[PDB]
Write a protein that holds these residues in place. Structure first.
Motif, PDB file in Angstrom:
ATOM      1  N   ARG A   1       0.942   9.500   0.527  1.00  0.00           N
ATOM      2  CA  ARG A   1       0.776   8.052   0.471  1.00  0.00           C
ATOM      3  C   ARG A   1       0.671   7.460   1.870  1.00  0.00           C
ATOM      4  O   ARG A   1      -0.235   6.670   2.157  1.00  0.00           O
ATOM      5  CB  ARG A   1       1.942   7.429  -0.294  1.00  0.00           C
TER       6      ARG A   1
ATOM      7  N   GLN B   1       5.085  10.835  -1.133  1.00  0.00           N
ATOM      8  CA  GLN B   1       5.187   9.877  -0.038  1.00  0.00           C
ATOM      9  C   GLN B   1       4.480  10.378   1.211  1.00  0.00           C
ATOM     10  O   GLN B   1       3.962   9.575   1.993  1.00  0.00           O
ATOM     11  CB  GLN B   1       6.651   9.579   0.270  1.00  0.00           C
TER      12      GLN B   1
ATOM     13  N   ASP C   1       0.824  -1.203   0.000  1.00  0.00           N
ATOM     14  CA  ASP C   1       0.000   0.000   0.000  1.00  0.00           C
ATOM     15  C   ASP C   1       0.861   1.257   0.000  1.00  0.00           C
ATOM     16  O   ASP C   1       0.714   2.124  -0.868  1.00  0.00           O
ATOM     17  CB  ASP C   1      -0.942  -0.002   1.199  1.00  0.00           C
ATOM     18  N   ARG C   2       1.773   1.376   0.965  1.00  0.00           N
ATOM     19  CA  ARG C   2       2.472   2.634   1.200  1.00  0.00           C
ATOM     20  C   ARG C   2       3.842   2.703   0.530  1.00  0.00           C
ATOM     21  O   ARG C   2       4.658   3.550   0.903  1.00  0.00           O
ATOM     22  CB  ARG C   2       2.622   2.885   2.700  1.00  0.00           C
TER      23      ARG C   2
ATOM     24  N   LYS D   1       6.896   3.454  -2.094  1.00  0.00           N
ATOM     25  CA  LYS D   1       7.284   4.552  -2.972  1.00  0.00           C
ATOM     26  C   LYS D   1       7.247   4.161  -4.443  1.00  0.00           C
ATOM     27  O   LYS D   1       8.162   3.481  -4.918  1.00  0.00           O
ATOM     28  CB  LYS D   1       8.677   5.048  -2.586  1.00  0.00           C
TER      29      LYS D   1
ATOM     30  N   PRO E   1       8.192  13.824  -5.266  1.00  0.00           N
ATOM     31  CA  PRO E   1       8.002  12.595  -4.471  1.00  0.00           C
ATOM     32  C   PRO E   1       8.035  12.721  -2.956  1.00  0.00           C
ATOM     33  O   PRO E   1       7.576  11.798  -2.276  1.00  0.00           O
ATOM     34  CB  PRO E   1       9.153  11.698  -4.954  1.00  0.00           C
ATOM     35  N   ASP E   2       8.568  13.807  -2.400  1.00  0.00           N
ATOM     36  CA  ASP E   2       8.499  13.974  -0.952  1.00  0.00           C
ATOM     37  C   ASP E   2       7.054  14.127  -0.499  1.00  0.00           C
ATOM     38  O   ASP E   2       6.593  13.425   0.409  1.00  0.00           O
ATOM     39  CB  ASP E   2       9.336  15.175  -0.523  1.00  0.00           C
TER      40      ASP E   2
END
Lengths: 229, 229
Positions: free
Chosen positions: B206, B203, A224-225, A227, B199-200
């Motif tokens: 996420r 995530q 799920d989490r 990257k 992407p920071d």
């Protein structure tokens, strides 16, 4: 394979097409894959005569695995004969002493059986056939476990470019196909997920607001989490 | 603007000070800003005569936007006249056929009106005035939407140095000022927050222990847990 008809037990050989397909399966997938063991169980469905199993292992196995398998089959048949002399009620034995089953009769070496599958099918008992078959299956399992080792589980790391499902597959394979007790596999798999599985996923598992107490739950959480990259 | 007094409808011009302020607003903020549309709605409060709206658009708009606006105003007035011939109860029409309103009377081209705002205010109906005004407002909206496109939403990325509130402002602007249906803007804004927004923050969104189901909630969460830098 034998058909127990009115005239008597008539021997029918296994199809060379099925045997060729099984041989190619063993050639591509290997000896230890679950699909290969399932196929062997399939072709090990009807009770086979020593001739059938011997020729089958001669065809599907290479020379060295065939030698190993002959050894293991002999050992397992000897254990069976020890249990048989330890219990006169073996489905291969009879009630009187004249029906006691010798290893020459199990390996197909007895009188009237050497090289002749028809006579073999004539004199053999169904209990004899099923005992021979189970012995051959256990011997195949031993040789398959021996020919290729499971990779050492404590040396498995998640590569820098490897995905997580491949790493989990490899790790669970090596842990379940090892010498650990069954009750020690899940904790080891969890603690290997936590310490292997390069530090991004390590921190992802560490900062889990919930407590993950199962490899499946850890895999679901990480999937799920993770990257996306 | 007209004042309907006892002697008759007397025309009063709009203040050149307000018109100058509105022109500078259009010059600095542009045609599509909500403040500009609010100012236009403000100066579009009292029903204006064709002379007033025509001179207003001549002053506040450049030459090419003025041509576009003349076109759009004509088209909208033609739609109004089609609806008027489709319903004899138009507040611009009358009951008999002698009060039917021609486009020469709407555009100020009829007899006794060309170039004369006083006569214009004399012969025009209040329903005529409000219809002309609404038509001009819709035409202004069309031309403003046409002169400057909304930026393509699917090409918006959060720059390496850009803050998150600026990125969210730009993205919501481009998504709401686009051709999407109204019921498809929130899911698109959310899924663009998740896949854009370098992407920071990707995530950060996420690994949200709660499920964020609204752009406002995502913005609040990210603003709370963002990396101060």
């Amino acid at each position: 394979p034998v058909v127990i008809k009115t005239e008597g037990p008539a021997w029918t050989p296994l199809e060379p097409k099925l045997i060729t397909r099984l041989a190619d399966t063993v050639r591509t997938k290997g000896l230890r894959s679950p699909i290969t063991m399932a196929e062997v169980e399939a072709l090990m469905s009807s009770p086979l005569l020593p001739h059938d199993v011997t020729n089958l292992m001669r065809v599907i196995l290479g020379p060295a695995p065939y030698a190993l398998w002959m050894d293991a089959w002999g050992v397992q048949l000897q254990t069976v004969i020890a249990a048989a002399t330890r219990d006169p009620r073996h489905p291969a034995n009879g009630q009187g002493r004249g029906e006691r089953t010798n290893l020459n009769r199990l390996k197909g070496l007895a009188d009237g059986m050497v090289g002749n599958p028809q006579g073999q099918a004539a004199l053999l008992r169904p209990g004899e056939l099923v005992a021979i078959t189970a012995s051959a299956l256990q011997a195949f399992r031993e040789v398959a476990r021996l020919a290729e080792p499971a990779g050492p589980w404590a040396d498995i790391m998640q590569g820098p470019s490897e995905s997580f499902v491949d790493f989990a597959n490899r790790l669970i394979k090596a842990v379940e196909g090892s010498d650990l007790p069954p009750s020690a596999r899940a904790p080891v798999i969890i603690d290997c997920f936590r310490q292997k599985s390069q530090p991004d996923i390590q921190q992802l598992i560490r900062t889990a607001p919930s407590t993950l107490t199962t490899p499946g739950e850890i895999i679901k959480y990480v999937l799920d989490r993770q990257k996306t990259a």
